[PDB]
Structure formats: structure tokens, C-alpha cells
Amino acid sequence: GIPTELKPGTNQFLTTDDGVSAPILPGFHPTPPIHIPGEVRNLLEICRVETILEVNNLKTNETTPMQRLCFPVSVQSKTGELCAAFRADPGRDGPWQSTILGQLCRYYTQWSGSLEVTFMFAGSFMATGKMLIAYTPPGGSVPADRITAMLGTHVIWDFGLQSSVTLVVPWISNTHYRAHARAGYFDYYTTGIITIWYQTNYVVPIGAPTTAYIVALAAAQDNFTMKLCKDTEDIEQTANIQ
Amino acid sequence: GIPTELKPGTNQFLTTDDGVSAPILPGFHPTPPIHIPGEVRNLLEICRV
Amino acid sequence: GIPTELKPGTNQFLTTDDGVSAPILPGFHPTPPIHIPGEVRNLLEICRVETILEVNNLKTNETTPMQRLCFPVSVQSKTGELCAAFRADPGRDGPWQSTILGQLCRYYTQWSGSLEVTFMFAGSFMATGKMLIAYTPPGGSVPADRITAMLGTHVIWDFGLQSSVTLVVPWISNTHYRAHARAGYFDYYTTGIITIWYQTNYVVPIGAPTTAYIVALAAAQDNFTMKLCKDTEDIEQTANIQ
Amino acid sequence: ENSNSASEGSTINYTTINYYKDAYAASAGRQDAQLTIGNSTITTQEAANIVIAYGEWPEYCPDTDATAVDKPTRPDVSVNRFFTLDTKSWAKDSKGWYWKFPDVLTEVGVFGQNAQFHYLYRSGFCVHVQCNASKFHQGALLVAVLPEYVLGTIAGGTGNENSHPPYATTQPGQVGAVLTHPYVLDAGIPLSQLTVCPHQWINLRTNNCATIIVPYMNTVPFDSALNHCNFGLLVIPVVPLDFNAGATSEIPITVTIAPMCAEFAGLRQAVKQ
Amino acid sequence: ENSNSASEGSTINYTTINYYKDAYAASAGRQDAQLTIGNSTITTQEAANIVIAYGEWPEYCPDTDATAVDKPTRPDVSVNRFFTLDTKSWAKDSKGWYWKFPDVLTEVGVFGQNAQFHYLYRSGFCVHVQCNASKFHQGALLVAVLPEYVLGTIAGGTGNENSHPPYATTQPGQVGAVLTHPYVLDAGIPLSQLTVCPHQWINLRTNNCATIIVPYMNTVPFDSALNHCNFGLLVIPVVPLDFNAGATSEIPITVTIAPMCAEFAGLRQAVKQ
Amino acid sequence: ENSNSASEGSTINYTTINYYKDAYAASAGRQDAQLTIGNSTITTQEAANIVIAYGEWPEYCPDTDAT
Amino acid sequence: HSTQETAIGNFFSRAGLVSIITMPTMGTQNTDGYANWDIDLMGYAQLRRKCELFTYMRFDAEFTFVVAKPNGELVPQLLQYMYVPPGAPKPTSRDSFAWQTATNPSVFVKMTDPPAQVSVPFMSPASAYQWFYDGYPTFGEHLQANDLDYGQCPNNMMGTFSIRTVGTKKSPHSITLRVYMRIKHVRAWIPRPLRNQPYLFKTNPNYKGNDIKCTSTSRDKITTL
Amino acid sequence: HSTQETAIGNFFSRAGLVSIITMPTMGTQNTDGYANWDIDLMGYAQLRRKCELFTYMRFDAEFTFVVAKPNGELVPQLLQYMYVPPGAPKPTSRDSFAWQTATNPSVFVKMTDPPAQVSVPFMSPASAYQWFYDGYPTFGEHLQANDLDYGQCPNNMMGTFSIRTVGTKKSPHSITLRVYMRIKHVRAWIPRPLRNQPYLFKTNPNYKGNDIKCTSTSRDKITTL
Ligand SMILES: CCCCCCCCCCCCC/C=C/[C@H](O)[C@H](N)CO
Ligand SMILES: CCCCCCCCCCCCC/C=C/[C@H](O)[C@H](N)CO
């Protein structure tokens, strides 16, 4: 016989190893496939669709989860109140867990590419006003005033003739990839802070409601890339499945 | 010798696995066949009667 | 199946054996590299740079290690005093342990090629004089006088207009390679003795210090070659690393 | 190397090494507007542009995938037309409603009668939703199409009881049914992820209408119309409509649907359910 | 055979046999003067020739390795210029000083202000040291550049205590800090091996000046200027200066530095530390 | 493949696979009257024809096999 | 940056635990020496959450059978595997006629040998596996007692898997089996939302009504991070 | 004379001991049946001195896992390996959900089988590993209690490695694991001096202040050999 040499690693099973096994049904011919709509060959196509991002999350809204989908806006008596603020990291515990982007991002460790956040105005047609949506690069805290937040990337948008605004989050990083940023020592990977600010005011005529709700959407772009698959925290077994 | 690597599934017997075994009669020459009527190569011909 | 034949050496692990194992991350694409200065593909480039050689090593200088980097020179009342002497073997316990050449040479057993030793004059600009730096081939002891040391390879150098001198140690050997010379039976591999001698005198004007220090440098040349990697004595574990 | 494998029916090619005669035992390898349909018509001037579900138009079953030897009927005019359903009165606490296709039209028109006399069913659908409001009304509706929408059960709230939803909830009929916990959609799945499937937003300040064209999606070319429900329709008031006192409080929601490219087979007796 | 490997980004080729689809699981195989910068200028007639660190000049970040989508600022005149620091009085027992770049210039000039408003930082540096002496003075200084210079701690001298150096020693600022045990450089590493890195000798009998051009060296193209210190600067009096009585005992050490090819990105708020 | 084997001195050829340098360690393979002599003479008229043992006549030793 | 990692080929292909089967010596269940396990892959939570991304799925499966004693040690015990297609006789005992292995595939492996590997083609009569089936498999009326048939796709039951120890006498050593699967040659359709609620039952996606877990964490104020 | 021996390819490529992990039956630590070991290669002195020649280093790693009983003998015990990337669940027990091996790689090996070998690519998000990091990973002020973050490169923590014995019952035999690494496809930069002082702590290069060992031997007189 042919002389053979055994090496370490024999008689082991690697779960990620792609091998060739023995068929139990010689020449088995399955059913011929048909044309089924919606063929998805890559998980990126699911990350590129706009999904609802929940900006408002409170301990008082745990009884009514439906209030998580939007945040209120009304008439202000002062200048430059902070409407909302949230982290820009999709793989961090927080608002990004509601979108399909963060859920599929938790399967992976290192992520890269630029993202986008879309706001939707559900208010009345005759209610006008303007908002200032700013993005602060890493290293900044929650800006105290509007003069502090404007120092970064911001956008100005109107209520009346447009129903949506898209804030493109640019890719600003020291490394080509970002691991998921967690508490403490892992804050080095934080993407930034997305703050929305009152620019002018919420103006409403007589006969229309003075309180409106804004729906926030979030998705990825064509340059978005992930790698290094892993387990997530979003499924748990405390008991057997009956 | 040639370096080899063992994979799971060694030392097993699969009943449907089609292998190659060692002959017990080297160069054994059976009896030459003749022409027998009714040669059936597929079970469908029996289902069609 | 294909007839196979097992040979002795199966189910063993050789630490120096270069094999092929199974990947745990199919098609994993790492981060694209960038241009980082100082790419070193061979350990010889580190051995060819001049590093400080400590000629003066005494039990009284153990409290002040900074005095090891140089040896004093002053005015002499007699003819031909021996300033310093040291072994020429880079892999022997002694002065050569301070240079990066000897440290990287301890990883290896058999070494070959010609070396070089550089002296630096840190004295005053107006102080003049001359030195005799000689190299004795193997078999000689420490020369008692200057007439004995001159019989080998020597060089004459001046203080005033030159700040450095390089003594090239030629390759004189019976064998193409030299194993590290240790005490007793292993003295067969000794390279030689490098002795520095007072040639004329240390002449200094009035107003300048009469005591100067000389810094010694050591490195290798392009013909320097090593082989047969091994463990060194310069790292020890007497306890676990907390 | 015979071709028995599962990936050999697609248009993508893969490289793989195989030491046996079956290709499925091999390894993985390198990876590489006015709409007039039939006798009925509609004109939507306030509506957003038509959203084609999964970018494919409904079409007749090709002979390549068709496993039936019968020659199907194509009653173009008596089958495919706009069918208007009942209106749903909106309220501030309204949780939303859902319909099960094609169970809604089983009792209505020629489409419903021929569906009872035929065992095999394939058609595409046309989804249209109508919600009217004035300039003083602020609200948002989410109209989405989720294929294979399965109803869950709270299991009494404890979780130790095994219970299934009855035929009234799983087969609401023409009138439809109302959601209980819209957050999980009674599927145990988030509402924020519903937009992954084809969807359209109805915002009362801009578009008061919605149109979605959903083709036939199943693992089989033909299937029984009575038992199998293809996809559901979800009209969810994400943003509650707000209006001050004196405004009209009755806001209807009208849903009209139409089949597209219907093929029936297996003419049989009268079968209700 | 896809190209996933680690050695496939270099210019050297290797031969290797691989039985799998990943190249990283394969085997090893066969192995194969007057300087005017910006608004400031200097003329050094006593200085030795300029020593280029690792034989590369500082240059702008190429688009191949650049991962940032922002367009960086290049304030050529207000950023890159000679910056003179405080002078260090030499004494016979002086153990030497060390500075942490780029932490020295964070408080100085336009370079320091734009560094606080920008998250990403890349630049090259110019190191220059000045020590003056007469013909009656004999001494030697060692000016070396050690990338990624980490400060250690004696751990109380016993070794059983875990302690880290505070921010005052790790970030000395513009004034700098003094060495404790110059033999180990507080790195636990020999001083005789310091010449492996780019270095220059200052010998008071010949050259009273030193010039070293150090480019940007990091595993990342851009990095935060505040937290990360690129390399340190070591001026070590190896040979103690000796002079008789009556000579001038005050010998200053002047260190002036300049940035080269600076690029800033990520304009943000004011961030001190 | 040196020729050390035992069957390599005959006129018949065999096919065999060998994984070593010696051919004897390989496998088997496919298999493929009046007579006057000198000063004396005899005449046998009643005798049957001469039977040659193993069909070979006695002959001198050739130089090939002669040691 | 390469997209090969986020593709469905590498994400769906690897080993996971679809089944846990035991044969204890003392107990009320498997102590007879054999086990009859109907094939269900949804008793395992985490791989179920991966397969619920998509409605229709077409693929092939490679299996790995690991055998060990409940304490973790091993004994020289010979085991027998057999696959029972729908309609084939299910074994009533260890000496039963069904284990005689006439036309049914079987695998023989010991406990000292490496785990057994087999390749299973696509055996479903339809074009792809249907995970969530909306409708009823049966005709006629459905009452409260017949509501169990809801969410049941007849194409998803491909057979029954069984194990036993060889020999007529009972084996003194207990055996625990762990079934593994690697998905390959996969084709996918119809993405779905990912379930945010804990699993309860195998056959249907029931959720606990008393507590509905929010998909995102909560904080004290919207303007404070 | 060939320079192939002194090249960084052959000098960096071979096996060395980066970790020692034990699972004793009686004791206060690992007796629960499982071990969670954060990945650190600097707890070993001699290979650390080899890697400290260079600042930035880019390479691949091949591993060898040797299992034996603390007395040196062997028992037929089945073991399970798993790699936990950052963010992935760390096991709280031996029956814990994390060991179920859904998307996380795992290796199965016995104690009678030869040591297991795996290949680890370059997983760091940067261009190369940074051994000595000068700075802080965190923003804002740093007090005496927060000084622990000094010398910590966030790119150097690539995950956590864990081991356990299979089965629900506790295994009566103790297990000692020795982790090995072979560096291949290596690229190097920025040479550094070789440390002449004994090691103390893993995370930072602390040296004992009372006694500073001279890098060279001492003699009585400079003129006498
Ligand atoms: C030699 C023994 C081979 C044993 C073969 C057992 C066949 C198991 C095939 C599993 C592949 C998926 C089959 C169906 C999975 C889920 O349980 C179904 N959706 C059930 O609803
Ligand atoms: C199937 C089990 C595989 C286990 C894989 C474990 C990954 C270990 C990779 C080691 C390669 C070097 C990683 C970092 C080394 C040093 O600890 C870091 N510098 C820590 O500072």
C-alpha cells in the first residue's frame, strides 16, 4: 500500500470545517425547483431597506410598546431645545436594536461603511417649521446648546412641502473596521452621537393639533460591510422547548 | 510517507454506501452467460402491465 | 478504497513541523494592510547597526549601571599602559551581552563572518593624543607590554581631528562556523582578544579637563551569518506571570 | 457525475470537489395614476406611485414549472376586476386590522364560485387602500404585505397551555379581523421590522391612497384556494390620528382588491370549506 | 483559491501548498544645512547631516490606504513651522528628559487648536536639539527616537504591587518629564540597545546640534492626537560633561520641533482631554 | 526501479505496481533406428521411436550460465 | 472589502445542534434499549432563529452523530443508526423486524470511533421547505379539537430517526446522542422579521402574553445618553 | 552561506506555549466542569521576549491543543472547544446555551486522539497587532483609579476561549490543557531593544525597582580577562 503519515488533528470534528460525507440515497433526484419571487443571495439586501428606528425608549413606555415608534414634537417657548439624542452605533444596546440592521449586525463582530437615518413627518399639512439634525464626531458629549452641536455635520429641513429627511452618517474612523462598542473599556469603538434640535419653531394654524409625531427610519448603504460571524444575545433558553 | 488527515466518519459502515472491497478469488472467471428471455432492467415495465 | 500503509511517526506532534490545518472561519477576509515604515524581513539588519558595547564592567559599578557605558582615559606617567581588554566572542558572557549583536546571537549556535568595533572620543576638542588598538589572533594571552601586542593586527588613531575609529575584526578560523565558546573544554572556539593601548599620551591644554571617557560601539558586517536557532539564558521564570 | 444536486436549478455556478457519485454529498466551495383591470377602473390622483412587490409582475403559469395535465380556464373579465370591501371606522385606540388572502373573495362574485368548483388555484393580487382626511388631520398608516402570516396565541399568558387559534381568527372571511397586540403582530415578531417586506406608507398630509401589486408566491405552482392562505394584509395606525374638537371624527378605511392572471384547474363538485 | 491571506499585501512572493479553500490555513513554504519650513527657518552650520528615520520622508496620506470619507484640511503655513520649546539646564547628575509627541504642541499655536476640533490626526515630525558648549567642555548627548514608548513602574520595588503611571508622567505636556532610571529607560530595556532605533549623537567637540526627520508611523492612517502618543524623544547625557573651575556652569539644552504634512479630519466641538 | 526480481530472467512479461525501490517486494499482477555414439554403435530394429526427455537434446554448457 | 462573509453561503453553512436523544438504563422512557425520535429541527432555539429569517428555503444537510455516556466517559459499545421514511415500519423493539435493514439505510459506528457523518439530499416533494404554513392540511370543517392541524405543512415531515444498541441483551451503559447538521447548497426566499420573543412550543410560534419583551433597552430620558 | 535561517520566517515559525488551563475535580476554581479563559498570550515569558523585538506585527496562527491528566495518564474523555468572539455570549455553565454551537466555531476531540490543530487568520481590525500602545482607550479625564487603561490596545482583544467536558454529569477525571501556537505568514516592523529584566505582569512591562540586573557580567579589573 501507499505509505501514509498521520498528523495532529486526526479524529476531530470542526463545526466550521467543510467536508465531503457519504450519501445515504445513491443518485437521489429531488424535486425540480420552480421560480419563487424574492430570491436573496446576500444578507446586505435586507440591511439596505428602511426599517423603523425607535428613538424614544423609556421605562414608563414599557406597558405601551406602541409609543416607542415615534417621539413627540410641539410648540416651544424658548430657543434651541434638544428634542432627542441617541447613539450612532448599530451594534450597541439601545435604539438600534429595533431595526433589522442592528439585528443582523449582532450576528457579526466587525462592521464598516456609512449608514443613513430617515425621519418622517406625520404632522398636519398646514403645520410648518424647521429642524436642525446634527451628527457629532466621536469624542463629543451631548451638546448643551445649539451653538455647540452645529460644529459638526448638520442638515436643515422643512415641514411644509417635504415629508422626509435623510441624514447620511459619514464613515469617520481610525480603523477600517469597527468592533461592537460596549460599556467601559469598549467605548473606543463608539461611532458618534446623533442629535436633533429645534431650529425655528413648530408653527400651526388655528383648528389643527399642536402636537405631532415623527417616525425615524434607519438602514445601510452600498458601502456597508460586515464580517466575523458570532452568536448574539437576543435568543435564550432557560428551559426546553415543549 | 504522505501526510494524511482523518475526518469524522472513519471506521463506520453505511449500508447504502457503494465501496470497493478485496476479492477473495484472484482473476476468477465465472460462467459465460447465455440469452435468457425476459430481461428487465427497470421496475417500471412491471408497473405498466 | 485506496490501499494505505502506516509508517512510524504517526499521531505525533513536531513543534518545528510545518503542516496544514483546518480553518475555523471559511473565507475570512482580514483588514487590508497599509504602508508602515521600517519593514524588517531579516534579523541581520538589526545586527548591522552600531550599538553601545560596554568595555568596563566591574563589581563596584553594579550600584551605578550608567558608568558601564564608557571607560576613562587620562594622562599617564609611563610608557604603554593597558587601558582595557575584552574578549572578541559575541556569544560569550561578558561585554558583548550589552550589544544587540550578542543578544540576537544567543538565539543561534554557529556564527560566522567578520565583525567591527567602533570607539568614540567624548573628550574636549583641544585635547590631543594617540591610541594603539590591537587585535590578537587566538592562542595569545593578554599581552604584558606593547611590543607583544603589536605583533598582531593593530591600528593607530588620533584624538584631535577625528572623533571615531573602527577596528575591523577579520575572520580567522579553522572552521567555516564557530559555536559559542564557553568555559573549560569550549575555549577551542575563542575568537581572540581585543586590547587597547596607550601609544603616545593624553595631552591637554590648561583650562580643560584631564580625564575623558571613550564610548565603544559594536556591530556586524555584510558577511555575518548565523544558524541553528536555540534558547538563550537571558529569560527566566521563577514564578508565574500575574 | 450525475446532476442530482439542489443548486443546479439556479443561474449561479459554484466550484466544488466531490469524491463520490452524488453531487449533494459534495462540499460547499467558493461562493459567487389610472388602473383599469377588466370591467372596473380606478383613478388615484392623490396616491403615491405603485409599489411592485419584489419587482415582479403577475403572469400566467409557464409550461416549464406547470405539473398539471389539465387545460386551465382563464375567465379574464368575470374573475379579474376591482373588488371593494367594507369600510373600517378609525378610532384613536384602534389597533389595526388584517385580512387573509385569498379567503376574502371566496364568497364574492364569479371568482368565489369557480374557486369552490376548482381544486387548483393560482393568481396574482392587487392591493389598494383608501383613507381620506382633511388638512387639519395628522396621521400615518402602514400598509404592508407579509407572505405566510401565521397567527399566534398568548397561551393564556402563562405559557404552559397549548392552544391554537380557531377558524374564525385564522379565516376571518370578507369582514376581516382586528389585531390584539400590534407590537408583536400576534407573530411574536417586532413591528419595526415589518418594512422588510413590501410596504407603503399612507400619510394623511400627502398621500391618502396606497397601491401594492403582489404576484403569486408559493413553493407549488397551483394550490388549494380554500385551505392555504397566501399572504395577509396589515393596515396599522402607527401614528394615531389627532384632531381637535369640532372636526369630523368619522374616518373610514376602504380596502379594494383585485385578482390578476387567475388560472383554475380540477373542475369538481361544490366544496364550501 | 481565494486570496484571504496575510502575506498577499506585500511585494514578496512565496510558494505554498494548500489542501483547503482558505490561504491562511496553508503552510509556510520557501522564504525569499538650512531648513525653511513654512514661516520659520533655521540655519545649522555646526550640525551633522540630517538623519532620516527609516529612510522615508513625511508625505500626505494616499487614497489607497485612506479609510476616511471626509476631505481633510491642509493649513500649510499655520500648522507646519518650527516650534521652540523651553530650555533644560544641564547638570552633572542630570539623568535626561523625555517628551511625548504629539502631546507637546497640543496647547501651542494653530496646530494645538485645530487638534482639539478634529478627531483624526496624521502628520510627520521634525526633531531638532540644541546644546551649546565651548572648546574646554567635553560631553556627549544621545538623541534617539523610540516609537511607542511605554512608561513602566518600579511597583514599589518589591514587585507584588500593581500600579500604573499617572497622566502627569504619561502626558508630560510642553514642559516634559525627567527620567528616573535611565539604564532601563523605565521600559525595563537596556540603554545600550537604544541605537537600534533612529538616533543621532551630539558631541560637544564637533556637532552641537542634531536633526532627525521622523515620518508618521502607525497601524492606522488617522488616529486621535489627544490619547495616542506616536513616539517619544530621549535626550540622554551618556557621557557627563566635565569642566574645571571658572568655566560657565550653565549649559542649556534647547529642543525645537516642527510638524510636516499635517492632515486633520472629523471637525467637532472643543475637546481638551 | 532497479531489476532485482526473480521473474526478470525469463522470457515472459508481467505487469505489476510497486511503491518501493525493490521489485521483489512488489505484487503479483496479471499473469500471461541406428545410434552410433563414439567408438560404439547399436542398431535397434524392434525398438519404438526414441523418446527425448523434456524435448531437449544434451549440449555443451554455454558461456552465459558457466560460472 | 469582500462581501463573501455576509453572504448566505457562509452564514448558513456550519454545524449546529438540532436534537438531543438519550438511552438511560434506569428511567421510564428509553430504558427498553431503543429510541424512536420523530424528526423535528425546531426544538432548538438559536438555529431556529436563523432559519426564521426566510420563509421558503431549499438546501442540503450533512449530519454528525456524537455519542458519549452522560458523565462524559466512553465504553466499547456498538450502536446502530437507521432512517425510517414515511410509511416504513417503525421499530417496536430492539430485536424487531424493522432494524434488520433490508431497503432502509443504516449506519454502524462504535463509541471509540469518530462521529459518523452522512449527507441528506433534498427530500421534500415541494420546491423548497415551508417553515410557516398558513392554512389547514385537512378538508371539511375544523372544530376546537381539530385546531391542532393549523401551522402544519405536510411537506415538512420527511420521516423518523431511531437508534438502538446491538445485541439481544440489555447494555449496562447509558448512551446520550447529540445530532448535528450543516446546511449546504442553500437557496433562500421571502425574508422575514427576526423574532424578538422567547420560544415556547416547537410546532407553532406562541408567545407569552403576560410579559412582552421590548426589542430595545429603556432609559430615563430621551435627551440623556 | 545562506541567510534563510536568520530570516524572520523560520525564526518566528514554530510551536510555543501561550496558555495553561486546568479543570481539577477538587478546588475552588474550575471544579464546576468548565473554564472561561480570556485570550492573553503574554502570560508566557520566553515567546514574549521574541515578540517584543518588534512593535507592529502581522501574522497568522496555527494552534495545537494537548490534553492530559495532571499525573500524565489518559482516560477516554470527550472534550469540547469553542471560540467566543467579542460580544458573543460567554458560557455560565456546562449545560449553558452558549455551548450549543449555533454560529460559533467549535472543535470536538477526545483524550486518546492526537492533539487538535486549527488555523486562525488575522482578526484584528487594524493593519497589524500593536504590542505596546502608548495612550488611553477612553476619552475624558483619567484619575488614579482609571490609570489601569494605560498600555491597553483595544485591537488586541480578539475574543475569549472556553473548554468543558461533554455531558450533564460531572466528570471524575481531572483535565489539564496546554495551548500552543505556530506563527506563519508573518510581517514585521519597528525593531525594539530586547528586554533585559524579568517579567512581572502580563498587561504592562513593570520591572522590580530594588534590584536592576546588569545586562553584562562583571569582573574584578578592566585589564584582566
Ligand atoms: C442515517 C441517518 C440519517 C438521518 C436523517 C434524518 C433526516 C433529517 C433531515 C433534517 C432536514 C430538515 C428536515 C425538516 C426540518 C424541520 O424539522 C421541519 N421544518 C419540521 O417542521
Ligand atoms: C477553535 C478554538 C480556536 C481558539 C482561537 C483563540 C484565538 C487566539 C489567537 C492568538 C493570536 C494573538 C492574539 C493576541 C495576542 C496577545 O494576547 C495580545 N497582544 C493581547 O494583548
Numbering used by the authors:
A (entry chain C), C (entry chain C): 1 to 242
B (entry chain C): 1 to 49
D (entry chain B), E (entry chain B): 14 to 45, 83 to 323
F (entry chain B): 14 to 45, 83 to 117
G (entry chain A), H (entry chain A): 73 to 297
Show the paper's wording.
Coxsackievirus A16 (CVA16), a member of the Enterovirus genus within the Picornaviridae family, is one of the major causative agents of hand, foot and mouth disease (HFMD) prevalent in infants and young children. Like other enteroviruses (EVs), CVA16 is a nonenveloped virus of ~30 nm in diameter with a single-stranded, positive-sense RNA genome of ~7.4 kb in length packaged in a protein shell termed capsid. Specifically, CVA16 utilizes cell surface heparan sulfate (HS) glycosaminoglycans as its attachment receptor, and human scavenger receptor B2 (SCARB2, also known as lysosomal integral membrane protein 2, LIMP-2) as its uncoating receptor. Cryo-EM studies show that 9B5 and 8C4 target distinct epitopes located at the 5-fold and 3-fold protrusions of CVA16 capsids, respectively, and exhibit differential binding preference to three forms of naturally occurring CVA16 particles.
From the same CVA16–8C4 dataset, we deduced three conformational states, namely C1, C2, and C3, at the resolution of 3.05, 2.91, and 3.36 Å and population distribution 15.5%, 27.0%, and 57.5%, respectively. For CVA16–8C4 C3, the radius of viral capsid is 170.5 Å, slightly larger than that of C1 and C2 (162.2 and 163.0 Å, respectively), and the two-fold axis channel in its capsid is open, while that in C1 and C2 capsid is closed. Moreover, the VP1 hydrophobic pocket is empty and collapsed in C3 capsid, but filled with the pocket factor in C1 and C2 capsids. Additionally, the viral RNA density is present in C1 but absent in C2 and C3. Collectively, these data suggested that the viral particles in C1, C2, and C3 adopt the native/compact mature CVA16 virion, the compact empty particle, and the expanded empty particle configuration, respectively. It appears that 8C4 Fab binds only to the native mature virion (C1) and compact empty particle (C2), rather than the expanded empty particle (C3). In the CVA16-8C4 C2 structure, the conformation of 8C4 binding site on the capsid is well maintained to accommodate the 8C4 Fab, despite both of the antibody and capsid protein display a very slight upward movement relative to the counterparts in the CVA16-8C4 C1 model. Further analysis reveals that, compared to CVA16-8C4 C1, the C2 complex preserves most of the interactions between 8C4 and viral capsid. Specifically, 9B5 is able to bind all three particle forms, whereas 8C4 recognizes only the compact particles (including mature virion and compact empty particle) but not the expanded empty particle. These data show that, similar to the CVA16 compact mature virion, the CVA16 compact empty particle well maintains major protective epitopes on its capsid surface and is therefore a good candidate for vaccine development.
